[PDB]
Each structure stands twice: as C-alpha cells, then as structure tokens.
Design a protein around this motif. Structure first.
Motif, short mmCIF file in Angstrom:
data_model
loop_
_atom_site.label_atom_id
_atom_site.label_comp_id
_atom_site.label_asym_id
_atom_site.label_seq_id
_atom_site.Cartn_x
_atom_site.Cartn_y
_atom_site.Cartn_z
N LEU D 108 0.79 -1.22 0.00
CA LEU D 108 0.00 0.00 0.00
C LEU D 108 0.82 1.27 0.00
N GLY D 109 1.97 1.24 0.67
CA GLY D 109 2.81 2.42 0.69
C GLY D 109 3.19 2.78 -0.73
N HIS D 110 3.84 1.85 -1.40
CA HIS D 110 4.24 2.05 -2.78
C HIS D 110 3.04 2.50 -3.60
N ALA D 111 1.94 1.75 -3.51
CA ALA D 111 0.71 2.06 -4.24
C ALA D 111 0.35 3.53 -4.16
N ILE D 112 0.25 4.04 -2.94
CA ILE D 112 -0.08 5.44 -2.73
C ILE D 112 1.01 6.32 -3.36
N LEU D 113 2.27 5.93 -3.20
CA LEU D 113 3.33 6.72 -3.81
C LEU D 113 3.05 6.82 -5.31
N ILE D 230 2.48 2.54 4.72
CA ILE D 230 1.88 3.69 5.38
C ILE D 230 1.99 3.67 6.89
N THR D 231 2.12 2.49 7.48
CA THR D 231 2.21 2.42 8.93
C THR D 231 3.39 3.25 9.41
N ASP D 232 4.54 3.12 8.75
CA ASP D 232 5.70 3.91 9.15
C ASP D 232 5.51 5.37 8.76
N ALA D 233 5.04 5.60 7.54
CA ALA D 233 4.82 6.96 7.05
C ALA D 233 3.82 7.71 7.92
N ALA D 238 2.72 11.41 12.69
CA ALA D 238 2.34 11.54 14.10
C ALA D 238 3.41 12.19 14.98
N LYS D 239 4.67 11.83 14.78
CA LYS D 239 5.75 12.43 15.57
C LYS D 239 5.73 13.91 15.26
N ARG D 240 5.59 14.22 13.98
CA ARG D 240 5.58 15.58 13.48
C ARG D 240 4.37 16.41 13.86
N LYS D 241 3.18 15.82 13.86
CA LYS D 241 2.01 16.59 14.27
C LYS D 241 0.82 15.73 14.61
N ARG D 242 -0.33 16.37 14.75
CA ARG D 242 -1.56 15.67 15.08
C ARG D 242 -2.24 15.02 13.87
N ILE D 243 -2.59 13.75 14.02
CA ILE D 243 -3.33 13.02 13.00
C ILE D 243 -4.39 12.25 13.78
N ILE D 244 -5.53 12.03 13.15
CA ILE D 244 -6.65 11.37 13.79
C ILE D 244 -6.90 9.91 13.40
N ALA D 245 -7.47 9.17 14.34
CA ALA D 245 -7.86 7.79 14.14
C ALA D 245 -9.34 7.93 14.45
#
Lengths: 273, 273, 273, 273
Positions: D108-113, D230-233, D238-245
């Motif tokens: 999925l990561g590649h896919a989105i890329l 995407i899990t790593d991305a 998240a480290k960088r800012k706020r993201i929602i689940a």
C-alpha cells in the motif's frame, strides 16, 4: 523540470480506415516500432517521468504495449532478438504511465483539457505521436524545448517553415524575433490564405504549456465540430503574456496522412543499415 | 466446393519485434488494411464461407477486427470515410469466423493440426497472411487453386519459380509436369543446397489439403528442431497418391521479412492511382 | 469418446446486472473459481478434448481465463499458493479451446446453432455453466450421460425431478421407462403448470446432441419470442430420431438466479474444510 | 472539500486464485456488482469527483466497467430491466476516472506513492475496495471522514474495535482520546502480537491523507521485506504533528478473506428484501 508529458491519442485516424477501426492510430508501426513509442522515447529523453496518455476507442493495444510482457522476453531470452526489446523494456521500467478516456472526442483542444485530470496545476509537455520527429545528431525536439523552457519559463510551441503555398493548411505564427530561432507569439492564424498568412512558420505537434492554458481552453468557445482550436487558446495566452514560438532542429514526417506515413517508414527502413 | 480456410496465425513475428509483442503479425497494416484482411478477402473470393483462424496469446486484435461493432463504426460517417469500411464490413456480414487457441508455435505443421478442431474432416484451404499475393487481371491465387481443385480432387501446394541460388530458403518440389503450371509432386525437399535442389519451384503459403493430412500430421515424427513439418507430411501424402503443385499466376510479396513488408507497402501505396 | 463439448455462453445474464455489463456471467466466481471452470472441468473428466465456447459481448475475460498466464505463475512459484492454479493449469494443458462470437444473444437455441461452426457433424456434449452440478462419489453428470450414448448413441439429455411448483420454470418430459432413471422421451411440454404437467422431470443444462439437431434448429420457427429454443427442437428430434432422458446422480444449483448463485457459494464454502 | 480519492487496485488477490489470474480482485461481485463499485459509490457520496485508480496487469475489465457501453444501453431501453444500470450510470455520469499503472505490487505504501501522479499536491482520500463498508442509515464511512476532516484539517485513518485475535493482521492504533470516537495517534504498529498489541483498535482501508505523506513515503525505509508501508509513514506524521484515528459508524466486511467475502455476500442478499 517538466515532469509530465501529455500524449493526445483519442484521434480516430479516419484517413487510415479501416484498420484504424481496431488498432489505434498511435499503434501503427513505422518499420516495427509503434508511432507512440517514438513519441514516448522522445519525451523520456527530454526528462519526463510521467507519460500521461489520453485514450479513445481502442485503447487496449495502447495500454498493453506499455505493460511488461513477461512471456516473450523470456521466450526470446538467450536468442538473438533480445536486442529488439531492449528499448521498449527500458521505457517501461523507467517510465510511469497514466491514462484518461477522452469524453466525446473533440480534437486536440478537449484532449489537453481532458488531460487536466492527468497533469494538474504544473507546466507540462504535449506530443502528437503522429508528428514523428527525428534529430540529426541533435537533442530530441522535446528536449530542445524543455531546455529552452528552463530559460523562458513559459509556453513553447514548436514551429517550422513550410512553402508559402503550403501555408493555407497550417496554424501559422506571427511573432517578434528574439533569439536564434525563438519568437514571441503575437498572433496565430489557423489555416490562413496565401495572401493573409502573417508568415511561413507553422505549428507542429510539440508543446510545453503553462497550467493556465487549461483555464483558458476551458473558456474557449468551440468551432466546427465543437473543436477547441488550440490556436485560439494560445493566441489568448499570447496576448496575455510572453510565450515562445520555437523553431526546433531535426526533421518531422507528417504521419497524419498516408503519404507521410509511407515516406516515414521508408526513411526509417533506410536508416537501418 | 471448399468452404473452410485455415489461417495459421500463431507465430511470434519475432522479426517484427517490438511492436509485434502487442500487435499480431497478421494485423500489421499494408496501407490502411491489415495483412490478414487481404488474405481473408482472397479466401472469400475463392468461395470460402468459414474462416478458421488458429491463434496465440495476442488474439484480441485479430478477433476484434472481424467482430461486429458500431461504436467506432457508423460513428464518423460525416466524412467521406464510410466507404473505407465497405469491404471489411461486407466480409464481416458475409463470412463466419472461428478460432482455436494454440498453446505454443511448433510450426505450420503443428498449426495445421490444431486447426483440425475447426475444419474437422473435409478438404480445406490454408493461407499464410504473410505471403501477400496480388494478381494482375487474374483470379485471386486461392481461387485459381480452389477452381483447379474442382478438377484434380487433391491437395494442391502452390509453387513459384525462384532464382538459381535463392533455393536454400524454401521447400523445393520434385515434380512431373502435367499441364500448364501443374505438376504432380514426386517429392519435396526443405531448404536444399543449390547443388541439391531438384528444382527451383519453391513452395508459397497457399495450400488446399485433404483431411487425411491430419492423420498424417499426427503420425509425423519431430525432426528439424522439435517441429513437425508439412514438408514431410506433404511428401508422405505425395508418395501415397497424387497431390498437385500449382504455379499460380500473380505476384507474391514475402512480408515475412521487413523488406517484403516495406516493399509491399510502397507497392500498394503506388497502386493508389 | 465424445470429443467436443459446447458451452453456450452469450446470454446477457440480465439477472446479474450491472456487473454483467463487463464480467461475463460464466466468469462469476463461486468461491474462487469461475463458473465456466467447473463446467470445463466436468467435460474434461467426461473425456472431452475440445472445449467449444460460444462467446458474445465480453469475452476476452473468457478467452483469457484458459490462456496460460506466466506473469503470475512466475511471481508466485515458490509460495504456498503455488497450488491454487494447479487445477486450471491442468485444464489448460490437457484441453483444447475453440471460440465463435454470436451476432447477438437470442437464447439457447440460437446459441447452439451458432456453435455449429465448431462441431460440424459429430455427436456433441452441451453444458450450461449456470447449472452447477456436483456428484457425491459419482462421475460427473456428463460422464454419466456418456455411458448412455455408448448404449443408445442418440441424444441424451439430463432431467431432474423438481417440485410440482417450479414445473413452470422448466421444460418437462413424458417418456416410457427403459432402465431405472432412464426414459425414452415421448414428448416435452414447455414450462407447463402443476395441474397439467406430464411429469415432474425437468431438463437440465446437460445435453449430448446428435448433429441432426442443427438442421432442426435452423428449420425451427421462433416461438416464445423472435427466437428459436431447444425445447421445441428437442421435441422434434425426439419425435423424428430418438432422444433419451437421464435422471442423474448428484446435486445441481441453478445459478441462473442470484438466489441459486448465493446458495452455491455458501454450499461450496462450507464444503471447504 | 477533498476532491480526489485514490483506489489501490494492483493487489494480486492471492487468496482468491485461480479466478484472480484473470478477473481483478476489485471486480469480484458481491451480489450483482463488483467490490469496486461500492467503493466509488462511497467516495462519490463523500463529495469526491475524481476517482484515481491504481491498477496492475488485469485492469481492462476495471477500466471497462466505468466506461459507458452504448451496446447494453440499447438492449436495456424498453426492456423490463431498463433500470439495472441506474446505479452504475449515476456513478459514470457524476465521476471522473484516471488510471495509473503500478509496475510491481509492493504494498500500500508504494501504491499510494505511485498514485502521486494522479493526485498531485493536495489532500486526498484512499479506499481499499477489499474493505466493504455499509452504514445503518448513516453517512458513508468515507463521508463521515471528509466531514471530520473539514474540522481537524489533517490525515484521518479510520479504525474499528476488533477481536484480539484479529489484531495480528491489521495496523493497530494507540492514541489520546480527544472526542466522540476520535483519537490523536501517538503510535502505530503493524500486525502486532496479541500480547504486545497496544489495542483492539484496528486500522481499516479508509484514509484521508495530507500531501506531505508523499514526501514521507519516498524517504521512508523499506521495512519488513523490501516493502514500504503507510504504517511507518503515518507514524512519522504523528511524531511531526496531530493526525486522527476515527472510529467510524456502520459495518465493515473484510472481503480481503473469502470468509468475509462470503459473509458480505449473504448480507447484501438478505439486504435485498
């Protein structure tokens, strides 16, 4: 760095019926390469990484040609014809392909407009596979253009000289000489009459356009066959700001007509020696 | 009256790579018509109604061409080009196409076998679209052949006199003259030396075979690089009984080679007067 | 052995729209196998060697399924999954496939007549993929029906004892007893109602027709539409020639209905353990 | 408002071979429509106008489905079924479709890329058709997210409360509760062990990402097995800012498994009561 190149391929190839009823024009071969490949190679050589293709009726052949054919490259491996697939294979591994179906086919105008879904807001290149161009030990016409663009940062429309007589069946320029073969479009007259033509410099299937062109096309009223004359759009843009008219180096065979196609194949057969 | 015509379109057309990895050899256009339309038109003219086409993995193009549609058909009939579809359209509504997928090209012999599933058990014509034949005020080549069959009632392998040294490139016949352009086949040697060729009557891609050929094919051992070849099968059938060789009136271009391909093009373009 | 097996597969499968707009009915999956594979698998175990499929609209999906695709056989070899393809891989290498497009769909009757181009004059099996049959430690319904053709060498059609209710959804027979579960068809009534149906034995998508049927189909005049259909033909054939009905062993799920389609998949899902 | 939705569809549908060697996974039918329709219908219902679909080799059928067929359109007209194409018609008429060809399925990561070529620099949604979501009279799941986005102006990754055994195969969240089923992601872990798993909050095939994810992805190190996911991305974001689940409403069937596929089937069948 112009990253995307838009290839308008929804044309019907009416002059090549009936074969063009199943085989999309862009796929007709020269000796053995499809027209569209020359076009993509040229673009890839100009630094483009994404080949955005606008397809029409029969797109299967088009999209399939740029798919990686696992079968034959192995069933040809160890033989003496793996050379034949070196080139195409190269493009496939090094290029990214995108597609979009041309709505009700309305010429090159809506082809570029339709292609906005593939380009987005960023300057891009445009190649007409039917205008088969070759450069006598010169960079591919498009590269000459992307290079020029790095300096002018504006839309560049490739032009060439035609016989004052031939003028009536071309889109002609009328600009201000600026450099060795560069001009500032000041007006564009589609198929003008012998004594009206503002020059003998014709527009060829090779562009580099700035995103605003989209918006413009979008505002262009349609003419015969509600086709959106790019000349109108370019003229519109030209009157707004400076856009170049470039006299590329190299030869261009008009594979638009059956005559050019034949002429085009022979030359390339002779090339092979 | 012969009604079926086998079209062994299963090769890989390696000599026409890379385009041929997506577009089948028989689909490559001459001018604006696929190599196969010419062949099918000749078959039809000869009196055939069923066009049995053996194919490989790239059939889509070949099958689509002969299927009835209307999208890219009746559409662009605003331009004089709706006359360009007259022939093919007539073929489509007058002939019956059938296909049989072959697993892997193993020669014309192996192909003629697979085709049995379409011809069944009755004399049938065979045409290799790669041998583009055209005749100056004379019936098509397959026609001359089917007509000759009304008299001879046997397999008829078409021949053509080649030059003294071009022999090592064809399957040569050893015959006995029977009448104007007709020989009884006493034997058949494949690509012989010059000092070995019993004649210079080379075999072209135009046959008419009797059902027993199937039985003979399946019984024919491998040989020249794994493949079963009609040469041995023909030689067998020839020794068991009388099979004729026909020196057809007319010209044939070997589009098996790009040279013939190109030449044929110019040739058919020229003919556009 | 009965070499050929017809697969009438063009019917618009209108009960499964909209997906049927692009995916042919026969390619709808049960669990992970397309419907048509169960049929061909049956025919193959019945001794059939040539799978004669009568395609229609979408069919590249049909023709492509039985083509040996390498991309995935490679990119998968070495994985646990390198087994899922063992069944179809086997069907591919052992069977032979022939095709023929329908002008347009008009029912089983017209579809079969079309297949004539793939049969000619030999008894042939017909299987309707919609009728998904399964046997509990018994040979396939066809394998069963083949034993009958050996014995009586006339048309053999499978019948199924249904609920008096659904007698109106099928064509029912009436025939003297010959052996347990074997009847000589005396007559056939089309979709009658409970009160006056000659029996509860309905005809299933499993036949074995003698070539004369083609002539009867042609001779046939449209009845329940502008189309001609097997019930009227089978009647005539049973009257002129002779055709035997067979009450088969095993279950059959009618996937002509979405309900039956759903049951099938559930059935085959449980069966997975 | 989010204008484009990416649709990763290069997946090898391994758990669904052999039918998946030919029919793309995204095109398997639930009842009478492909998994992909529900997806696009859902994106459309959330205001999306562009449907950017990433495809693999088998994608002809996927492109054709959203292509307007003038053939079956006639058939339909007048017929009692002139309404089975209403659902797909609506879609085709209110959506734009662009396609990008993914060379090799590397997750999925590649896919989105890869899809960067269709989305461009702007926030976008992502829907994995394998995850069929239906809502008990609630706005579609992807809609619940575009709305939620209007406020949080950041990436939103949909989540679902799952059984602890299921954890081992989804990306699981661990975030600070903020609101009604909304969380700030403090970390994400791919397929955790049932005992180290940070929660039973699994990530679903539903995303709304912000452009920077693209840049992150290219920098991201191919993790567990030459793949970037995407899990790593997303963690990086998240480290960088706020993201929602976001804990969506409505049910989600995981057609990723035949077990979920079957389940989803039965469901929508009953649903049609």
């Amino acid at each position: 760095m112009i990253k995307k190149c838009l290839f308008p391929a929804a044309g019907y190839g009416t002059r090549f019926l009936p074969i063009t009823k199943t085989i999309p024009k862009e796929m007709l071969p020269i000796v053995d390469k499809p027209l569209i490949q020359y076009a993509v190679e040229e673009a890839m050589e100009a630094g483009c990484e994404v080949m955005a293709i606008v397809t029409g009726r029969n797109k299967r052949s088009l999209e399939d040609y740029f798919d990686t054919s696992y079968e034959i490259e192995h069933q040809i491996q160890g033989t003496n014809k793996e050379n034949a697939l070196k080139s195409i294979r190269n493009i496939i591994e090094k290029c990214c392909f995108s597609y979009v179906r041309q709505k009700q086919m309305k010429g090159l105008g809506h082809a570029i407009l339709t292609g906005e879904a593939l380009i987005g807001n960023e300057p891009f290149a445009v190649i007409l596979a039917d205008d088969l161009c070759i450069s006598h030990d010169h960079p591919s016409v498009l590269k000459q253009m992307t290079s020029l663009y790095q300096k002018y940062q504006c839309s560049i429309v490739a032009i060439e000289e035609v016989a004052l007589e031939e003028v009536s069946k071309y889109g002609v320029i009328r600009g201000e000489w600026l450099e060795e073969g560069v001009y500032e479009i000041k007006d564009m007259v589609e198929k003008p009459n012998q004594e009206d033509a503002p020059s003998n410099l014709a527009v060829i299937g090779r562009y580099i356009l700035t995103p605003d062109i989209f918006e413009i096309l979008s505002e262009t009223k349609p003419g015969k066959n509600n086709e959106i004359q790019i000349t109108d759009a370019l003229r519109t843009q030209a009157k707004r700001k400076r856009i170049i008219a470039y006299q590329f180096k190299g030869k261009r065979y008009d594979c638009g007509s059956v005559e050019g196609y034949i002429e085009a194949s022979n030359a390339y057969y002779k090339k092979r020696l």
